[PDB]
Design brief:
By secondary structure, this protein is mostly loops. Bound molecules: zinc ion.
Length: 7
């Protein structure tokens, strides 16, 4: 799967 971290 694709992953996004919005810190
Ligand atoms: Zn993945």
């Amino acid at each position: 799967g694709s992953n996004q971290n919005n810190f």
